[PDB]
Amino acid sequence: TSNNKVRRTLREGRRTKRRQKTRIEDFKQLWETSGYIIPHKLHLNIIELRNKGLTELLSLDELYCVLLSMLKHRGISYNAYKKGLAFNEKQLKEKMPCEIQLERMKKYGKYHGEFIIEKEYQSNVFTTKAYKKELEKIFETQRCNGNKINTKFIKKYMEIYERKREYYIGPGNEKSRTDYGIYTTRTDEEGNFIDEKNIFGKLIGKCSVYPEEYRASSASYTAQEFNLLNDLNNLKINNEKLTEFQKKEIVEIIKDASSVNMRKIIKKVIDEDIEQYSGARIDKKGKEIYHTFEIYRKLKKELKTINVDIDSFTREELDKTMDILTLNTERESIVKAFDEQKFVYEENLIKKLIEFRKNNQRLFSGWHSFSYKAMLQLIPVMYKEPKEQMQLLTEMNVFKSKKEKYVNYENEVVKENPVVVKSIRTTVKILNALIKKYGYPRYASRVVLNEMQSFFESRKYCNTKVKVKYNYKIDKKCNRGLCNQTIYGTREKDGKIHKISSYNIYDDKECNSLKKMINSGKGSDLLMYNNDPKTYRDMLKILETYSSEKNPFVAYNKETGDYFRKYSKNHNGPKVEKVKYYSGQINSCIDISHKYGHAKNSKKVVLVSLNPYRTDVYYDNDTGKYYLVGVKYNHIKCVGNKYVIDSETYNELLRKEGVLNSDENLEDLNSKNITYKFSLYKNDIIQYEKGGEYYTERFLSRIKEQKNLIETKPINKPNFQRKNKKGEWENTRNQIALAKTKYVGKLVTDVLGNCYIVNMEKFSLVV
RNA sequence: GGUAAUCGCUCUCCUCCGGCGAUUUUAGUACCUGAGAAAUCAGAUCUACUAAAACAAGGCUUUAUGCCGAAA
DNA sequence: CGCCACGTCGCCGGAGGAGAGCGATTAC
């Protein structure tokens, strides 16, 4: 679902960012080990340094800065994007992208790939060929100008520069075993690591007859033999069926033919006129559907120029080579696969097959359903006995069943969409529960229906009529969405630290937001944009003259044409398109400013909207006080199995909620009779006694700062939180203070519907 | 009805390799305001432009085409 | 202290498997 697509985008982005950091670090190491020192003062006018280096000598500092910049924007190697590519192509016939960006700076003062200007589409997404040409020019100029660079440095820098792993290798290396790439963590009997040649190979589907074998590639010898036998076997001519001798002769002729016209060939082999035709699959659109050997004829006409005999090839060698040509698409993988195959190939054949793959890719459309085992079992009996393929399939009746495992006794069905997997898991859980209690009377739909029918027909004396649970559960996992990204920068006003969000003017919704903020007087009181007093009333002047019911700036550039700039006698003011404004205080935050060089917990840069994990109801028998000590996702140091809250970052919430003082700790609880009464997770069940009616409600989380604040959900349905008025469902919250109440209770509820009352739990420092 | 195989045309899922961004902190310049004839200085450090770093909090040993980390 | 309105990340490009659906069919 959208969530796994998100997980993927983040994983790929993280891998690319980490590969970029490694690139920069390796460049720094090469700079150190080559006899040069990293400078301390960095230059900002990088592009002008590129222009200088094209012709004139550059210092070590300038060269270091330009190389560091180059390693970050090394371009792409092989709508607005394609049109921008066309413009870079038409401008690259004379010059390199550095000069184009120079001109963009000179006449527009910007570089990035967003240049709506009819409209022109200047951009920054260039091609690696131009960057490499620029690097070659720069390096040659510096070398000819008596620089300190030696050829080893340029060669090694370009080796670092062109770091690009291949899509069929993935992450991990020969010492960093991960199950996401080629170098895996599984160990053999000797303890050595396991190494593959291509990742997609294991993903190939199984055969439809023998479920322990890999399918065949539809471009080989045996595949085309089988398909041409099926096609010519079905045809009926002159109310006579083709005989075995006729089948052999027609196969020999069609293999030996260059262009196929089976009306003519068939009348030649039969030696009899033709009055009627059946089995011919002429398209109503005007195409004569035939299964003649296609890859055969092209391979014959191609390899016969260099005079290489395909008939000299064995069947297994041809099938194997046709499989590798099907899967492996690049030169290196193909060469390694042909090396692994002990058969010896001339380099001419390798190049010949590679160009054949690259020019007629459409032939290798996919994999034939069967495997080579069933195909080799079928073809000889297909040739000897002139019978239809479907009947020959059921002769050995190899499609018996797969009920052996089911009569021996989820994973046997789960293995056969990451959402319906969970759905069917819940279905089978409930079915087992009801079976143990009492009672036994699409692609996914077909699979699940067949599995249920098979399982219920495996039972003895069963007469079940199978004629044709939305992931409620609970949450118990760690390492979920920790925070909501969006790094925030915060400032200070009269001793209070306020988080600052910028407002985009050029968005209609935000244009209306600024409209209602300015008109209500709630903007001028804030000190944002008050640092320029003259630059503020210009907003009002532009606004009230052109208020309307649209974006005032849109009409401003439509009528006047000029944009909005900063007050200046010389009209030198940079354009204003985004205006910051205060948001409010921060109470819940993640202290990050220590990752910017600032002091610990300086709160200069924060991240907001943390997520909850658990809250532990606490009860003392001395007076029955309430301590709904909550826990959030940040306080957990987990990875898969070690859901450890740790000793610290748990007593601090304990103390803030009032359980403990500065001295008392997690061991000073028995003294006041303090221990768990429950352990509530998201989408749990809790009891309440508001006003002495018992309200059984779903616990969600803790919010705000007020002590004993619980958010509740209607037991019945979370999708009906509180419908207050006639026909509106406001998402009203159940912010409630549990400072003065007297009861709380959990009802562990399995799917069958039973309710279990819970008592003093063990502890929560799992692993 | 159901099953297998083919051909052509239209949608979805998983995995991998990259690019352009966006948001922040620090620094420079412009824009503002004082001193100054101006330059330049100090201070504001709001609105942009340019560099570097951060980019789920955090963890590894494999010190590198390094690795994990937002879904059963 | 209790209410209730605000506000939260996008776009491209190359692959390769694996699922379906709709038309023609050949049949069990």
Next chain:
DNA sequence: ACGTGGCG
């Protein structure tokens, strides 16, 4: 969906 200040 659901945190998380401000303003009576």
